[PDB]
Design a protein around this ligand. Structure first.
Ligand SMILES: Cc1cc2nc3c(=O)[nH]c(=O)nc-3n(C[C@H](O)[C@H](O)[C@H](O)COP(=O)(O)O)c2cc1C
Ligand SMILES: O=Cc1ccc(O)cc1
Length: 374
């Protein structure tokens, strides 16, 4: 019977337990090159048959919206990732690279030639939100430039190339970052997408871009090496949809149809959910609604389902035991608990995490120096 600590066949891959390292931007990849700090970071968190998803990784120079995040669009970057991947594999881990384009959630200082960030729209993120700049101050999100149709196809090509480069680096697969108000979410969410062309309006039009990406990377490296992450009900950086339930089901129906058409299943669907507790962990109304949404989306998707967002040991156990999810990803707890899988198995205390060093750049401090049990 399925439990949080029981084995799982994720299509092509075999896992020994259901605890997953959620993708986490940490900003230690100085000048976008994966390095020895990242090697130790992922090695520390690796387990035999444990699934790891990397931090968001740039698919292009226009992809960036944080400092010192890794890319996978140059040979030098690929060579850096090889070292990370080899170390993870030496521990028996399965590791996917998350492909990340931030869209309008960026700033001129992050853009080639100081160009405007690109998006579905010309509308900027509101002043209620601010962006961390490379000089450790916070700045204003600028007006983005809306992509023309041919430019969207160029971004699809960037994802395709990024996927091929990931496989060259030895990654087991990739995850399409389609969540949290970044580029693809800027097209899906009717709170952001005000386009009047073939990429705006209907759910069909709004889902077109992300489906083109899924189709392209599946063609390049195989459906069974492709995972997709979405967050229809998370509002981060003004990324709301008027009907998250329908948006989620629209994406899922299209994934199901693509799988049926091509004759194989994607590696997984990965959905993050909002929480309504003070600290954003665990459970307290909106809670019950969100919980049912997640069960509805799980039930509608044909294949492996990863849940994420505020899961605890008890909630992770329940999720797998009751069939609500096949795999459970952990973000913040994995920051401060390199041996999180062991700690969960032993019901050991979890180290507190320090948010002040989430996005600083030191290879050791607040990055690789959280203690393991051993
Ligand atoms: C510091 C930090 C960095 C994150 N970076 C990413 C990222 O690069 N890509 C992504 O999809 N989610 C990212 N997330 C969201 C997490 O994957 C996760 O969904 C979120 O933290 C909620 O899960 P949790 O309660 O286990 O932390 C990040 C979260 C935090 C706190
Ligand atoms: O979902 C992507 C993401 C990236 C950086 C963050 O800090 C949080 C989320």
């Amino acid at each position: 019977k399925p439990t949080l600590f029981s084995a799982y066949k994720m299509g092509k891959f075999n896992l020994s337990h259901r605890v997953v390292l959620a993708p986490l931007t940490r900003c230690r990849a100085i000048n976008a090159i994966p390095n020895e700090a990242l090697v130790e970071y992922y090695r520390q968190r690796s387990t035999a048959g444990g699934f790891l998803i990397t931090e968001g990784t740039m698919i292009s120079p226009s992809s960036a919206g944080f400092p010192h995040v890794p890319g996978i669009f140059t040979k030098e970057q690929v060579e850096g990732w090889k070292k990370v991947v080899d170390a993870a594999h030496k521990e028996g881990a399965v590791i996917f690279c998350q492909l990340w384009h931030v869209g309008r959630a960026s700033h001129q200082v992050y853009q080639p030639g100081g160009a405007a960030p690109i998006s579905s729209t010309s509308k900027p993120i509101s002043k209620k939100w601010e962006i961390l700049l490379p000089d450790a101050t916070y700045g204003t999100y600028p007006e983005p430039r809306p992509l023309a149709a041919n430019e969207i196809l160029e971004v699809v090509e960037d994802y395709r190339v990024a996927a091929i480069n990931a496989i060259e680096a030895g990654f087991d697969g990739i995850e399409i970052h389609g969540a949290h108000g970044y580029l693809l979410d800027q097209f899906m969410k009717d709170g952001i997408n005000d386009r009047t062309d073939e990429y705006g309006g209907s759910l069909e039009n709004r889902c077109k871009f992300i489906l083109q990406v899924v189709q392209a990377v599946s063609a390049a490296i195989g459906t069974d090496r492709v995972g997709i992450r979405i967050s229809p009900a998370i509002d981060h950086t003004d990324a709301m949809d008027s009907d998250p339930r329908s948006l989620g089901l629209a994406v899922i129906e299209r994934l199901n149809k693509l799988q049926f058409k091509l004759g194989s299943r994607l590696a997984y669907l990965h959905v993050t959910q909002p929480r309504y507790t003070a600290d954003g962990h665990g459970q307290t109304g909106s809670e019950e609604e969100v919980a049912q949404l997640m069960k509805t989306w799980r039930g509608a998707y044909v294949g492996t389902f990863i849940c994420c967002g505020g899961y605890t040991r008890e909630l992770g156990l329940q999720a797998v035991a009751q069939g609500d999810a096949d795999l459970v990803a952990f973000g913040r707890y994995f920051v401060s608990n390199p041996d999180l899988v062991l700690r969960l198995k032993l019901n050991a205390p979890l180290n507190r995490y320090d948010r002040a060093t989430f996005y600083t750049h030191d290879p050791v401090v607040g990055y690789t120096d959280y203690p393991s049990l051993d």
